[PDB]
Write an enzyme that holds these catalytic residues in place. Sequence first.
Site, mmCIF file in Angstrom:
data_model
loop_
_atom_site.group_PDB
_atom_site.id
_atom_site.type_symbol
_atom_site.label_atom_id
_atom_site.label_comp_id
_atom_site.label_asym_id
_atom_site.label_seq_id
_atom_site.Cartn_x
_atom_site.Cartn_y
_atom_site.Cartn_z
ATOM 1 N N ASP A 1 0.839 -1.191 0.000
ATOM 2 C CA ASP A 1 0.000 0.000 0.000
ATOM 3 C C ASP A 1 0.878 1.246 0.000
ATOM 4 O O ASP A 1 1.734 1.409 0.873
ATOM 5 C CB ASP A 1 -0.931 0.004 1.214
ATOM 6 N N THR B 1 -4.285 7.719 -4.949
ATOM 7 C CA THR B 1 -3.205 8.334 -4.182
ATOM 8 C C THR B 1 -1.846 8.033 -4.803
ATOM 9 O O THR B 1 -0.936 8.868 -4.751
ATOM 10 C CB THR B 1 -3.248 7.852 -2.734
ATOM 11 N N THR B 2 -1.691 6.847 -5.392
ATOM 12 C CA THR B 2 -0.430 6.503 -6.038
ATOM 13 C C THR B 2 -0.279 7.210 -7.379
ATOM 14 O O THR B 2 0.830 7.618 -7.742
ATOM 15 C CB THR B 2 -0.332 4.987 -6.215
ATOM 16 N N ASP C 1 -13.746 2.308 1.574
ATOM 17 C CA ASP C 1 -13.375 2.740 0.232
ATOM 18 C C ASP C 1 -14.413 2.315 -0.798
ATOM 19 O O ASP C 1 -14.501 2.919 -1.873
ATOM 20 C CB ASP C 1 -11.994 2.197 -0.136
#
Lengths: 529, 512
Positions: free
Chosen positions: B48, B81-82, B379
Amino acid sequence: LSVFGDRSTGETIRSQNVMAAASIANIVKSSLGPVGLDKMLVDDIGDVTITNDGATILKLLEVEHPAAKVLCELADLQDKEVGDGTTSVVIIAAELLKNADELVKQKIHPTSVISGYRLACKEAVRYINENLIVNTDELGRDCLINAAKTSMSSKIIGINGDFFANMVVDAVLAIKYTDIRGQPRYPVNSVNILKAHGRSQMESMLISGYALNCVVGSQGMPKRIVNAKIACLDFSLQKTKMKLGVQVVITDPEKLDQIRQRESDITKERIQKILATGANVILTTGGIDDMCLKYFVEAGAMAVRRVLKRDLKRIAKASGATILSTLANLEGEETFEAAMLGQAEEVVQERICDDELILIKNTKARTSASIILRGANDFMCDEMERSLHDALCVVKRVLESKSVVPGGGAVEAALSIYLENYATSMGSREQLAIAEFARSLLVIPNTLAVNAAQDSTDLVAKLRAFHNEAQVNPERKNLKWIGLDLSNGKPRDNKQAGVFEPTIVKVKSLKFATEAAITILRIDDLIKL
Amino acid sequence: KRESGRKVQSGNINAAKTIADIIRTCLGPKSMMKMLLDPMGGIVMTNDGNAILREIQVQHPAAKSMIEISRTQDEEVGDGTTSVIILAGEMLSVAEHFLEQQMHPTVVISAYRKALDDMISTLKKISIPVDISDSDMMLNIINSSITTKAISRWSSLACNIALDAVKMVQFEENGRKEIDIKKYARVEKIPGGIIEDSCVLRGVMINKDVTHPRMRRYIKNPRIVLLDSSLEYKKGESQTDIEITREEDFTRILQMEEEYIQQLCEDIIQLKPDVVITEKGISDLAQHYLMRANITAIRRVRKTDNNRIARACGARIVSRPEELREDDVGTGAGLLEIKKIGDEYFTFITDCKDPKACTILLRGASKEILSEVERNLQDAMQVCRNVLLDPQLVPGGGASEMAVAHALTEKSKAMTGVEQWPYRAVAQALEVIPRTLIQNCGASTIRLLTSLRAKHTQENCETWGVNGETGTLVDMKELGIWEPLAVKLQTYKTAVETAVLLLRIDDIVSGH
């Protein structure tokens, strides 16, 4: 020699003071101008602070040097006396020391250098006062619509130049109020600016009056009234208490129901004194009880509850009335008839999306306005909101300090040519001191050219060629009062463009910068204990 | 001490690119695992990206601002987010115009802002609408985050839990479709049961436990009372502390505390409610007077919780217990259930209607399952929340990135000036997303990426992405990788504003 500290003198001490003052200038140097880059400020905790304001950096900047603390205190004097130009004073004060240190290596005594700056700064103020301009374009001529058009050309709002800028001119002219001895200035917060998404961006409309965002509560109240009486009360019509932090505990159960009748009966006396004034529009900041709203429908008055304190202060100035703090006369409750009441003509509620504004139009003496912007998308109208307020202060500040001067580096360029020819008419070792003062002023147009992503050598050269031809002959064929354009990177006339700066800003900036260059130069020795 | 000049803008690139180089292989279903060595010898293999950078301590200021923006992006949207860090690190990875060409920063910044407007306009052309009335159409979208999870068995029911909860919080009357999950969709773990026993409850749930046997077990029309003040010995306006030592000080205070609480609890039992919920705490002497009325005592509740409790039953909040009125009732509530579930006492103020809130119950046999199912449904609601805002999708798997890269390239041919060179570099910076997808599969990067560009030139850019599992080229109409539009709009908008923010800093100086 046996002493408890270190002592050193010579050209090194003056060199250390110049290099120390040059380090403070280079920090705020690239941040000069509206296009200046942001700079981080790191503390000992590791937090970061970012902004482009040179005045904010100097206050939060910490550097320990004997001479550096002089320039930091200098910015505080410029900020408290005026509040603008603190960045330019620090930059000029450093360029004065850089050229003065070079003259010391020429065997020029510092006293002759100090006497030069005092004569040059004195002759600079005299030459500026002749090139000034007073308050104009308020009647018979309009170049004042182009005043805000230049500041609005850097935003998406600048698509229509004369449509949006014409309302800014009518907004600053309507708010003029003396208030002192024929002074009048232009107060900061007057016009209420809002936004709307309706149907197009071309529907922005100017309004004369105050824009109050509230509700009429129950539908029993009329949304329009022609009543001139405006009631302004700070006292709350809701349940009265001893205090929020002090609560009275009632042990007797029969006293509980006995008190519940008291606040209900007192409002029955309070509602009769309010309705005796015959005032329809009613403003209550402390809130209105639900039972008191029923008596408002019987008389047909228009009342509002939970009125903002900042809103009523602008309404009192718009309606020309006095705000009533409380009904307490120190003897009995009275509404002060014929006194706290205001004057108006037409009060009607206007339809806006999701919010309904209460508009009070055509009062006795207001000197205020409101502008509602009907745009297309939220991203489009939001930028137009702050764009008008920014350009409004530009037109405001010019028409406030009444004597202004063309900015954008036009002041430093003209002084550089005049003071350089004045140096040859003096002599007695005053030439080099005055001549270096003219070259030191060129840093202001030089710094603004670098931050504008343009060649600094060519712009300053073309700028000096225009002001010289103005000194050669008065004839109009030679350019006069030419400044610098940061957007297009070329010379531009700032008189027609509408980029001005107050006179006291440029005059006091040269005086304080001169005193700082003298104070640091007068130190010939460093003694430690 | 201080650093200025081009070194700062050159140093910020090496700081932002180094952080980006870590998570390059963490994108996609093939994402490589990362090993973190604890100072005590611990090892965590999690892939993650949010968890890795959370435990990494970086000493560079721009590296901190680069991470904090990703944390803020995670709270608003639970995906991407990545992608934000990789794109923001790639756009700053071009130092050619900054140093060699000696271009001014504001000139390059003007190229990014002109490109950002065209990048957004291009995504809206290649998008596709969405039918939210079909439960199966919304199911195929949420299965993207459901794969390789423990909830995949009950995922059919887990979808209905997340899909219905977001529709409840969604308000279509105002027109903005405001949805707040951390408020009305708030969820709590319930020990006991299985994953199938997790259902959706309409109302607010109180986790307080029943201390004494006397309470209302079941009520047709409950009565809920909300009040700010506490019930205890009256405290003065000063800071004087109450410390009980001498017996003389005991009876004096005990008698005053008894009479002060009895009077406040008197007006409470006069209205005869079915429960008492107080914001502050309740003492032991105050609970004695409450048990005499056979009611439930609730204490230690916040303001925002009471606002959702007030709107649930239609009650009213009163300042002090002495001022309580008959206007404060729980009339309209469904029922009150103190029944124990999972060796714990629950308080149900809930109802059969939708008072602008809801409650989600998570049933499980152990805390290890409740911890996994919770974050899997958090999520999951984030995905359904972004779709209902703007029911439009975009092709995934590197198709949308190569789609915009082709539009910016053809648009640059009409650009006349020096800004055309950095304007084209943005188009080639978006190619890192399909590059990492192929590099993880082990296939050839140059051979597949070159053939991928020729497809968007001729065929429609809406299709012909990159298959993550197989590694070859496939159309996105035949595969379920279609991403929401609201996620991508904030992904490129944040990545560009992050790159501009680091370029605007030419100097770093300490101070206090």
